[PDB]
Point group: D2
Chain length 246, copies 4
């Protein structure tokens, strides 16, 4: 059990990729800390994992509020004495082409997807370098490699988290702390359930595996990167798109 | 005279690469609008170019203030009837290790370097698509490709502007408007005179041409990209580093 | 036991990363076919793994000779009924500055490192698409991302295998066959013992983890990519360098 | 006239991008040496440029025959005393999916597109470093960035020439010799004239400028890169695709 006893904080863990990652991490023996802006939902999520015998906890955290981030990290240290893994998965989209995008749409996405990631990483990175081991995993996107129509704000933020990744991999690597990113393509979470079938068909046609990912297939990449199997993987952004013509 | 009569707005034009770009664009026949937060200095810069016979103007613009950006664009239209080129060159650094970076250091760099670029591009893009031709050139950095120690905020921002570049190239290209980025390496501008020699030796040794760039050598890349010689170059980030090992 | 009963052909398996990969695959339950130009050595390597209880076999294969490749594939099918995984790890260097590189130095590296990879992949790809599942893993290098002094031929070949990877991921992905590459940095294999200390200090100082990899740390990446944990990873080249400034 | 008096060797110059580059270089004042495997056609091409008053010469060169390459370079030195620019543009395609590609198809493309480029660059690079200035420009492709169905051989070769580019930029940069690559997308040369319209429409739909390039639009990028406007551009592969979703 490759993450046995390791303490993992996962943001956006109430549902979607975040929840799938919490589940997989618990299966790999991690102590999992599920954080989400949605308090009731994340406590239900944690409750489902606790029933399996896993050691888990749940916190309401808005990652744009550094005081909430700090309070959670302090509570995790009080409870489990260390932080071994951070998965910066919480994100939002507010799509609009440049001609129509509002300042509020722009700001909201930069706040969660860049400032939020900065807040959580800054809050744990010192704990990790002090103990001489840790891993910070950042959620990017294929859009963070290639751009995408209507995603001025999202693309900037997901490119930007690769900037974080390479910078922190440089700063923290020498102290035994690895920093990597995952760049998912089209993943079959709740966000796609209202998308018209013909639109989904266009999406899957652009994928070289000709299908959407299940969230567990992104979780499994975070699990690899957290584990010692990725001990010489640092500063990378792994594309998890099945291959794409975006 | 490959830019003859074309109207170019350049931000951060009082000095450094911005001023060199204004100088080169004027040499190539462009009508140049020099914008900077340093009003007296950008006025003096414009005066030097006017003395050579160029058609120029000078505006105080804080790119984080959209009303100021909009007012400048309106004034340029009143004076010169159209906008053909935008060079988003204004940027700042507020360097710190992740461990030490303050919220103000982080927020300020995201504001100028991402929000400011968004503001200027959004302000001109409709003018350009309506007339069926235009070019937006974004200043990135080698740091926006590879990250860099102490530059959590700057690296996120310069990665992010490549996200803008690809996204806007997708949205605007079909309307005849190209969007590209330049990623300079180490440039001999005013910000380097105070830097220690052994730091500059490390800079030059990591460059495959074994020397710093002069600002004119970055200006000439912007001039190429603005010109019709780059008519099939869209969505790219051109590294202008002499080759390097950062 | 994530590769239990899966049949893996590994080229260059007598030593180095190839042998470490065979060892790890066997540890994960794979049936391993060790191939190398050094027959006695790869036989001894297989014997070490068989002593641990693994199901293994050992073949002399010069990957530049397609009849030898084909004969080995036919033998594997006769023995084990299918081929599930191919690791194209055999490669050579024949380093020289452009000024001095001989035709033989150039031709030989292209032959083993590109033609050999082509030969092995073509020999197994139809088996994999016919059965609806398979994975081909190609050995690249950080040199296949950034180039390197004295490696005109090697760099072309390791860039080229990423070209293969993306192309085959496009052709074979829709049939259920994934194709990926690994780009190792500096690995503590047998080829480094003779290397001067000050050359190795330059290697480690350019790595953001400030150490060389052990071969098992590259093997574990191949093991991940072969496994179902990488089921939505297709067409990628994963840098396995600890982060670096080459 | 930015290439005045500079001696430029261009391979594949009888038609297509090569001829367009010869024409543009002559317009920029270069002494142009047109090389092609097609002797009658390249002499006609040269004759057209000579009529404009340009200084030009024509040679039959098969770039896979080093003796022909060497003889041409010697003849150019005898005639013009130096070589300032090399454009490695000659290339071929022999497309087939991996399942069907023959050894001869593979070999032919590697021979022209990698060995040929090596031959020409090796033959001139010493002349350039000795005089302390030169530029070598390599023709890659968008396929050398992203791969493409049916192009195992072409993609490997055009990735591979970026490997050459980065390696030679490293080796030769310190001696004042720059090496860069251009990666064209879909260009309206003779090769596309038999392509069905509906197929061309698919191609242009995937282009963010929604049109094919004219060959002069690729020539203009080579002209920039050869000129002193690109004096701090070294080791780069410039995508000239209009933006693409390949």
């Amino acid at each position: 059990m490759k993450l046995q006893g390791r303490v993992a904080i996962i943001t956006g863990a109430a549902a979607g990729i975040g929840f799938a990652t919490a589940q997989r991490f618990a299966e790999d023996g991690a102590i999992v800390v599920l954080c989400d802006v949605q308090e009731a939902r994340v406590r239900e999520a944690a409750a489902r994992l606790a029933a399996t015998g896993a050691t888990v906890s749940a916190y309401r955290v808005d990652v744009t509020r550094r005081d909430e981030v700090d309070a959670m990290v302090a509570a995790v240290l009080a409870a489990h004495q260390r932080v071994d893994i951070l998965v910066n998965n919480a994100g939002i989209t507010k799509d609009a082409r440049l001609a129509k995008m509002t300042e509020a749409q722009f700001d909201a996405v930069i706040d969660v997807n860049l400032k939020g990631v900065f807040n959580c990483a800054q809050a744990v990175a010192g704990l990790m370098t002090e103990q001489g081991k840790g891993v910070i995993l950042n959620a990017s996107s294929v859009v963070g490699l290639y751009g995408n129509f209507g995603q001025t704000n999202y693309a900037a933020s997901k490119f930007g988290v690769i900037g974080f990744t390479k910078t922190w991999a440089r700063e923290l690597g020498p102290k035994g702390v690895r920093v990597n990113a995952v760049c998912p393509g089209f993943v079959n979470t709740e966000i796609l359930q209202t998308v018209p079938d013909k639109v989904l068909d266009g999406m899957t046609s652009s994928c070289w595996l000709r299908r959407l990912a299940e969230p567990a297939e992104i979780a499994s990449i975070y699990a690899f990167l957290a584990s010692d199997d990725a001990s010489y993987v640092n500063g990378v952004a792994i594309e998890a798109s099945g291959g794409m013509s975006l």
